[PDB]
Amino acid sequence: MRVVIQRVKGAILSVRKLEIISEIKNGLICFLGIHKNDTWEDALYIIRKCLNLRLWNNDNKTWDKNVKDLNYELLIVSQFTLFGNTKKGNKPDFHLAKEPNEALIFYNKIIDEFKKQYNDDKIKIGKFGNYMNIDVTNDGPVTIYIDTHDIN
Amino acid sequence: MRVVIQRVKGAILSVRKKELEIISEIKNGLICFLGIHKNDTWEDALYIIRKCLNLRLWNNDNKTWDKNVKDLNYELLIVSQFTLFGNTKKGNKPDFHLAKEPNEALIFYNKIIDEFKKQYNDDKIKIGKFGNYMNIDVTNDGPVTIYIDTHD
Ligand SMILES: O=S([O-])[O-]
Numbered sequence: 638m639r640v641v642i643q644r645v646k647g648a649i650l651s652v653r654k655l656e657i658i659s660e661i662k663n664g665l666i667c668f669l670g671i672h673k674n675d676t677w678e679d680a681l682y683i684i685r686k687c688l689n690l691r692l693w694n695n696d697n698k699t700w701d702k703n704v705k706d707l708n709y710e711l712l713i714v715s716q717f718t719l720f721g722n723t724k725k726g727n728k729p730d731f732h733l734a735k736e737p738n739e740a741l742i743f744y745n746k747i748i749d750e751f752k753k754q755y756n757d758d759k760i761k762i763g764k765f766g767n768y769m770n771i772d773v774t775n776d777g778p779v780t781i782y783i784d785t786h787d788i789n
Numbered sequence: 790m791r792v793v794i795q796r797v798k799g800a801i802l803s804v805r806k807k808e809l810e811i812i813s814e815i816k817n818g819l820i821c822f823l824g825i826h827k828n829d830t831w832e833d834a835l836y837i838i839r840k841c842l843n844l845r846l847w848n849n850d851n852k853t854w855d856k857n858v859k860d861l862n863y864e865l866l867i868v869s870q871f872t873l874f875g876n877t878k879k880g881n882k883p884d885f886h887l888a889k890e891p892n893e894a895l896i897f898y899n900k901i902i903d904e905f906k907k908q909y910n911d912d913k914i915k916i917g918k919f920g921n922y923m924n925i926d927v928t929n930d931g932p933v934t935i936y937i938d939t940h941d
């Protein structure tokens with residue numbers, strides 16, 4: 638599983654009819670790529686790190702507060718392009734990306750877990766598989782990358 | 790070297806002077822968050838630049854993943870992003886020991902920006918304020934997020 642996490646002052650997600658369907662203020666936008674061979678342990682890890690990474694400064698301290706500490710939100714967005722392989726040519730290929738039907742179930746299960754580990758009202762999502770327009774106010778910016786197939 | 794590339798309809802980069810003032814802007818094109826590693830060689834940088842300029846990330850009324858940023862005469866906003874080397878494996882406070890030290894990194898980055906201009910066009914390459922806090926409003930188009938680590 639891969640995730641690109643970006644610290645934001647807000648984000649506004651839109652889909653084509655453009656129309657708004659999701660919005661957050663301060664918090665994280667998480668581009669989430671699900672792998673062909675991802676287990677639930679892979680998803681737990683991502684969820685844990687999104688909720689607990691200390692990406693905000695506080696008072697005298699830096700990298701001190703996490704998204705929950707500040708009661709901030711998460712916009713969780715499915716992003717298979719993160720498995721776009723560009724090693725062998727300029728046309729990205731996504732053979733590693735878990736197939737769209739199983740991926741959607743996995744993603745939904747992941748969104749449930751996010752809400753369970755945090756707060757139902759604090760977890761926003763995008764339209765899985767659909768073209769989306771997302772206006773993001775990057776705060777910093779702060780971009781973090783995690784590939785669960787780097788730990789075991 | 791690591792880069793997170795995101796397809797955008799535009800991006801507006803600001804720095805603090807309530808102070809936030811604009812210093813960079815693109816319309817359609819790529820925003821590239823660039824992390825420079827302690828052990829990066831110019832070959833590492835060449836690779837990134839090549840992939841940013843040549844990845845076919847736009848559809849072409851006929852073919853998906855068909856056109857690259859140059860083909861469309863689109864722009865690139867190149868942003869330094871050491872947080873990409875933020876290690877989160879061992880705890881929730883990211884540590885950036887792998888990130889090339891700030892002074893050598895700045896030279897490398899500047900050299901990289903020269904090469905971008907370059908291999909493309911002087912007017913097509915926008916940058917951020919290295920080492921400074923930035924506010925970046927990004928209109929993510931898709932979105933399309935690509936990740937590349939040259940040490941792969
Ligand atoms: O937005 S500025 O780089 O023309």
Ligand SMILES: O=S([O-])[O-]
Pocket residue numbers: 805920921922
């Ligand atoms: O001037 S900025 O780094 O707050």
